[PDB]
Scaffold this active site. Structure first.
Site, PDB file in Angstrom:
ATOM      1  N   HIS A 579     -52.069 130.920  23.311  1.00 10.86           N
ATOM      2  CA  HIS A 579     -51.278 131.785  22.451  1.00 10.86           C
ATOM      3  C   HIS A 579     -51.928 133.156  22.274  1.00 10.86           C
ATOM      4  O   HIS A 579     -51.223 134.161  22.153  1.00 10.86           O
ATOM      5  CB  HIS A 579     -51.033 131.113  21.094  1.00 10.86           C
ATOM      6  CG  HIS A 579     -50.102 131.887  20.219  1.00 10.86           C
ATOM      7  ND1 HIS A 579     -50.554 132.552  19.095  1.00 10.86           N
ATOM      8  CD2 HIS A 579     -48.778 132.122  20.363  1.00 10.86           C
ATOM      9  CE1 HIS A 579     -49.491 133.152  18.582  1.00 10.86           C
ATOM     10  NE2 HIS A 579     -48.402 132.931  19.319  1.00 10.86           N
ATOM     11  N   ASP A 622     -51.807 125.176  26.755  1.00 16.93           N
ATOM     12  CA  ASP A 622     -52.062 125.375  25.334  1.00 16.93           C
ATOM     13  C   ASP A 622     -53.402 126.008  25.025  1.00 16.93           C
ATOM     14  O   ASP A 622     -53.657 126.415  23.885  1.00 16.93           O
ATOM     15  CB  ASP A 622     -51.891 124.059  24.581  1.00 16.93           C
ATOM     16  CG  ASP A 622     -50.440 123.662  24.415  1.00 16.93           C
ATOM     17  OD1 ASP A 622     -49.596 124.563  24.190  1.00 16.93           O
ATOM     18  OD2 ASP A 622     -50.149 122.449  24.485  1.00 16.93           O
ATOM     19  N   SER A 717     -56.312 131.648  15.428  1.00 16.03           N
ATOM     20  CA  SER A 717     -55.663 131.082  16.598  1.00 16.03           C
ATOM     21  C   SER A 717     -56.740 131.085  17.695  1.00 16.03           C
ATOM     22  O   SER A 717     -57.430 132.091  17.872  1.00 16.03           O
ATOM     23  CB  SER A 717     -54.481 131.956  16.999  1.00 16.03           C
ATOM     24  OG  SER A 717     -53.940 131.551  18.243  1.00 16.03           O
ATOM     25  N   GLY A 718     -56.963 129.942  18.321  1.00 16.00           N
ATOM     26  CA  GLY A 718     -57.998 129.831  19.339  1.00 16.00           C
ATOM     27  C   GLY A 718     -59.391 129.545  18.811  1.00 16.00           C
ATOM     28  O   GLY A 718     -60.313 129.338  19.598  1.00 16.00           O
TER      29      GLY A 718
END
Ligand SMILES: *[C@@H]1O[C@H](CO)[C@H](O)[C@H](O[C@@H]2O[C@H](CO)[C@H](O)[C@H](O[C@]3(C(=O)O)C[C@H](O)[C@@H](NC(C)=O)[C@H]([C@H](O)[C@H](O)CO)O3)[C@H]2O)[C@H]1NC(C)=O
Ligand SMILES: [Cl-]
Ligand SMILES: [Cl-]
Length: 767
Positions: A579, A622, A717-718
């Site tokens: 993402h 993902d 995120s991540g």
């Protein structure tokens, strides 16, 4: 069986009076001499590994006392510890001393008030001990005894049934031998990961009795179940017969609210918002599994509010087609000294120092937070008597610092130790260093030149039979052990490490202090700054101790903008969420900043490295690997996280931390690396109707509370989801945000790193 009829305990010594001590070569040889029952009823046996000695005794933990001791293994005949009956209880050897009418027994060896027809004289093999209930004649009515009531010769006793053939309630305590499911599939062994990887690891949950491949209920399922040998079916409920006998003694019950209302047995049948409760035995307007049939010991009668599961307060399904269920408002009880909001254990958090703590001398002065043994086992609390009873309590040792489950040395042994949470291992030394010639692990492979015991006494030559004779551990008995001269060796891979026979005439053997080998430099997952380890019940988590998460990466645009987290996995590779790469497909558009704490005003030491490559995980897409333009300089502030072993499944309740720079406006700690402690929620539990109804795949993992903890998105995120394991932090998850943020009464879902390790290491060896 062979030894399936015994309860084994390593490091335990039962003291006895009526015994027989003798030389034996093996546990099996020793067990045999116990089974060959002469003089007394061998109820337990001790084997002293290093001395070839074997003690056979008529004592049990029930009738005697156990103490912490060296080398010795204790084996107690299950039968004599078993306080329940099976069929007629022909083989029952419990301690029940009153009949089913509660009248006190008479002894089998007394002739008053009754002169017995059955006695130890006549039925020597019958176990006619004390006044205890027995079945000498194998009467279909079960144990009985002669009575202290003169106008009443005998009567039967009320011994509760043994969960071998059947289950009480939902099988929470089912310890039977059924090993196939409802459909007939053979169960996968709990200690195996094939064909199904899972978190129900016996070593992690010893008290859950996840034995061999038997059906069990360790997690409040409807019934005992197991993982299956069928690759296509992960798990299935088992077909366990229900017992007709009354369930074991449980209470007290209240007609008023006390705590979470688990003990409520009143008649309220309306919810807080005023809804009518649906009868538990009915499936309309709502279908459910909380039925009197599935939960007999929960008293799900009529439509009364009940808390049969682990909810905040009593509840019920409603007759309102629009409201599946709702909590009821039960009036709290009055004053009493039992339900004062005090009961149950829960266990303390994992505060063991990552920067391996050290002790001086014999460590009687050690006051640290370490609570992990030499083999990775968790320490038992000094105040708890379970699974091991002991007398090393703060009351008996006021100055020993006996708090929580921390490693201590109350009895002045060679170094800090603790009772272990494993029922089979009484105690072990702690995983602590004492503040080239060194060993690896327990030093079974050590071939160094240390010749001195921990006390300063020199070792006796292995070849010598003076001052100490030794029939074992000679250069001829153990030719591969390196028993040369008088060097400290660990030929038996003893948990304590290298030892030797000593020249002290009064001390046969003792340990040597052989240090663990140093290691070249910075290892993965070992921060150089101790993480503060933010406690669970904190909203928004905590500000991290600067550089306590050195694998923490900040992904940035070409314009100094932090927009993502990542994890340094090696010096040229960062793992992040796919993402994070949505905005640009150009590696050049990304800057990886390393060793930061500040989000904006970077410290002068922060490393800023451009990404040269972007590899998207193809199967799920993902997560993605970022190759750095140049390798990162590994320092005390920049260290990669360890990667788990392929398919490793983090155990349920494992405490993990999610780290990252929170984008929250009105709060303290803005622009600072934060951390939040999250327990892992095993996929089977995470997937139940109440949370994420079959929406979680194996390439994913859950983490976070199930009782209204939070309602936002943690880390970046991540960002990393790391879980401490023995000595280090392992990257178990990758934050993905869009995958599903942790909401009240629902955990967060992360990418399970263990399912992508082969792909990662694959991408790293080729590119
Ligand atoms: C168990 O997990 C739960 C949730 O499932 C809690 O997070 C818990 O922390 C404790 O909370 C309870 C109240 O809900 C206790 O009051 C507790 O405090 C005690 C304890 O009972 O363990 C009180 C007690 O004085 C002392 N222990 C004794 C005498 O056995 C210690 C401590 O010295 C005091 O808190 C200081 O006054 O703790 C909360 O700490 C979790 N259990 C833990 C962490 O053991
Ligand atoms: Cl002890
Ligand atoms: Cl009789």
């Amino acid at each position: 069986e062979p030894l399936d009829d015994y309860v084994n305990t390593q490091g335990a010594s039962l003291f006895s009076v009526t015994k027989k001590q003798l030389g034996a070569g093996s546990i099996e040889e020793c067990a045999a001499k116990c089974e060959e029952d002469e003089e007394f009823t061998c109820r337990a046996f001790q084997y002293h590994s290093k001395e070839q000695q074997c003690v056979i005794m008529a004592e049990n933990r029930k009738s005697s006392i156990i103490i912490r001791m060296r080398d010795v293994v204790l084996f107690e005949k299950k039968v004599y510890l078993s306080e329940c009956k099976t069929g007629n209880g022909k083989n029952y050897r419990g301690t029940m001393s009153k009949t089913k009418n509660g009248i006190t027994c008479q002894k089998w060896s007394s002739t008053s008030p009754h002169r017995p027809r059955f006695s130890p004289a006549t039925h020597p093999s019958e176990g006619l001990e004390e006044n205890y209930c027995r079945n000498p004649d194998n009467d279909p009515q079960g144990p009985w005894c002669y009575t202290t009531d003169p106008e009443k010769r005998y009567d039967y006793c009320d011994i509760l049934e043994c969960e071998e053939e059947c289950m009480h309630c939902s099988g929470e305590n089912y310890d039977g031998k059924i090993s196939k499911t409802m459909s007939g599939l053979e169960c996968q062994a709990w200690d195996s990961q094939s064909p199904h990887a899972h978190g129900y690891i016996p070593s992690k949950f010893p008290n859950k009795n996840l034995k061999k491949n038997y059906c069990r209920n360790p997690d409040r399922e409807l019934r005992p179940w197991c993982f299956t040998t069928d690759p296509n079916k992960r798990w299935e409920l088992c077909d366990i017969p229900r017992c007709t006998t009354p369930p074991p003694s449980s209470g007290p019950t209240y007609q008023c609210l006390k705590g979470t209302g688990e003990n409520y047995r009143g008649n309220v049948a309306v919810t807080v918002s005023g809804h009518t409760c649906q009868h538990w035995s009915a499936q309309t307007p709502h279908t459910h599994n909380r039925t009197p049939e599935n939960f007999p010991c929960k008293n799900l009668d009529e439509n009364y509010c009940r808390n049969p599961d682990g909810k905040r307060a009593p509840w019920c399904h409603t007759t309102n087609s629009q409201v599946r269920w709702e909590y009821c408002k039960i009036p709290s009880c009055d004053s009493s000294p039992v339900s004062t909001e005090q009961l149950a254990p829960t266990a303390p958090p994992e505060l063991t120092p990552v920067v391996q703590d050290c002790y001086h001398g014999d460590g009687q002065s050690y006051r640290g937070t370490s609570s992990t043994t030499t083999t990775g086992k968790k320490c038992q609390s000094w105040s708890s008597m379970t699974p091991h009873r002991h007398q090393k309590t703060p009351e008996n040792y006021p100055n020993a610092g006996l708090t929580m489950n921390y490693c201590r040395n109350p009895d002045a042994d060679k170094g800090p130790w603790c009772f272990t949470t494993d029922p089979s291992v009484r105690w072990e030394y702690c995983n602590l260093k004492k503040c080239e010639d060194c060993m690896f692990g327990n030093g079974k492979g050590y071939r160094g030149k240390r010749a001195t015991t921990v006390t300063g006494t020199p070792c006796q030559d292995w070849a010598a039979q003076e001052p100490h004779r030794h029939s074992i551990f000679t250069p001829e008995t153990n030719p591969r052990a390196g028993l040369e001269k008088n060097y400290c060796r660990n030929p038996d891979g003893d948990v304590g490490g290298p030892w030797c026979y000593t020249t002290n005439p009064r001390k046969l053997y003792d340990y040597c202090d052989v240090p663990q080998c140093a290691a070249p430099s910075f290892d993965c997952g070992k921060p150089q700054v101790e993480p503060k380890k933010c406690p669970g019940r904190v909203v928004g988590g905590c500000v991290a101790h600067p550089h306590s998460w050195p694998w923490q990466v900040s992904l940035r645009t070409r314009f100094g903008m932090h927009f993502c987290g990542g994890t340094l996995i090696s010096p040229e590779w960062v793992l992040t969420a796919a993402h994070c790469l949505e905005k640009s497909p150009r590696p050049s558009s990304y800057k990886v900043i390393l060793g930061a704490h500040q989000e904006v005003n970077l410290e002068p030491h922060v490393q800023e490295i451009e990404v040269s490559r972007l590899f998207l995980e193809p199967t799920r897409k993902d997560i993605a690997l970022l190759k750095l333009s140049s390798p990162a300089v590994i320092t005390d502030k920049v260290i990669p996280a360890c990667l788990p072993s392929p398919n490793y499944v983090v155990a349920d309740r494992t405490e993990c931390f999610i780290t990252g720079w929170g984008e929250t406006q009105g709060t303290f700690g803005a622009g600072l690396l934060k951390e939040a402690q999250l327990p892992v929620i095993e996929n089977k539990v995470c997937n139940r109707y109440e949370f994420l109804n079959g929406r979680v795949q194996s390439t994913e993992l859950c983490a976070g509370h199930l009782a209204g903890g939070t309602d936002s998105c943690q880390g970046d995120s991540g960002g990393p989801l790391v879980c401490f394991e023995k000595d280090k932090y392992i990257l178990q998850g990758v934050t993905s945000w869009g995958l599903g943020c942790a909401r009240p009464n629902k955990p967060g879902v992360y990418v399970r790193v263990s399912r992508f390790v082969t792909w990662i290491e694959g991408v790293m060896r080729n590119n």
